[PDB]
Symmetry: C2
């Protein structure tokens, strides 16, 4: 390591600062934004029922009519398809709250605070092994300049501190990057987890309509 092992230290620092300065505040925004989105979804849930019952009611009247009885069956079936799709939506929504939103809230609420302490702790021991090396060198200097094997004790003590430091930094940086990568990953995963539940929503709708649509269409063209 040259005088560039300074960069590695400085980098560990920025990684921690950036998670606090940008990552968490933006994630919070993401959460709030997601919640707003969640709230609108729940809205569709309540309104869906009013519509459902109105379909059924048209269905009943048709089933009670003088000569449009067969159409009552079409209406009921349409209401039925709506009920099932509406249920797959609620499944997705529940998965939106329980696996993405609630999770992220919990993992972000105190995260900056701990990263702060984690960073401070890192710098502290980093500053410690540095001050210990300097003072150790400020001695190998007081000796070499005074001698104008006690020297062998330092040159070999310096190199040990130089090693124990170079591998404390490199070590911090590794952890740091894990810290950064892990937070994005977690986000992506849960997103996938809900996107997967989303798929089961569209697939059921596509499926359900595929079966019934041609029949409803024929009942009309009848």
């Amino acid at each position: 390591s040259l005088s560039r092992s300074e960069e590695m230290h400085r980098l560990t620092e920025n990684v921690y600062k950036t998670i606090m300065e940008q990552f968490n505040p933006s994630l919070r925004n993401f959460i709030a934004m997601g919640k707003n989105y969640e709230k609108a979804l729940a809205g569709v849930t309540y309104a869906a029922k009013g519509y459902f019952d109105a379909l059924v009611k048209m269905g009943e009247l048709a089933s009670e009519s003088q000569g449009s009885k067969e159409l009552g069956d079409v209406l009921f079936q349409m209401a039925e398809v709506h009920r099932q799709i509406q249920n797959q939506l609620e499944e997705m929504l529940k998965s939106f709250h329980n696996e993405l939103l609630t999770q992220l809230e919990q993992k972000v609420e105190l995260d900056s605070r701990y990263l702060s302490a984690a960073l401070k702790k890192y710098q502290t021991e980093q500053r410690s092994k540095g001050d210990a090396l300097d003072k150790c060198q400020a001695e190998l200097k007081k000796l070499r300049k005074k001698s104008q094997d006690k020297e062998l004790q330092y040159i070999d003590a310096i190199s040990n501190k130089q090693g124990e430091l170079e591998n404390y930094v490199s070590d911090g940086y590794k952890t740091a990057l894990t810290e950064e990568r892990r937070r994005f990953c977690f986000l992506v995963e849960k997103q996938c987890a809900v996107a997967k539940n989303s798929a089961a929503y569209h697939s059921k709708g596509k499926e359900l309509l595929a079966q019934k649509l041609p029949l409803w269409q024929q009942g009309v063209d009848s």
Copy 2:
């Protein structure tokens, strides 16, 4: 129990009555729930945007990361799939509005008033033919009791045959008039339930296109995103 003409006449009156007293009111309630449902979805549309921006921003922060840049793309793709799907919703929405709701709205608005005039016109006309028949048949009975068999003058017998002729004609016109009203009644009734189903179909057709566009975008990318997670 006044023949098939009286029974059919009654069904005509009940058919118009059911369209005005139940079909139309329940249809207005249907439109009303349709609109509440429409607003709800519209609500989703707006929130969708903010969510979109958020995703993109996390994507940008990831592309500027040191060792998470890869994930930046997975987020951007998710943002994309979401934006597209969101547009497909806007569409189902537009058809839900332009083909069903607005359509049922003007159809229903002044309907019972026209159905009401239609009913009255039918009732009035079928009552004239009915009264005309009864009077006619009444003057006949009145004429017969003046009969003196073998001695009835030609003036007499000719008049009787004139009435028999007229009764036969009025009698038949009335029957068809009622018989014709009934067919039209069933058509008025039939047509509305049918129009509802049609529009419901059009919206369903739109709904399939949205749901299907969703399954392709996700079934296509999900497995790949599933990999980026695997790291």
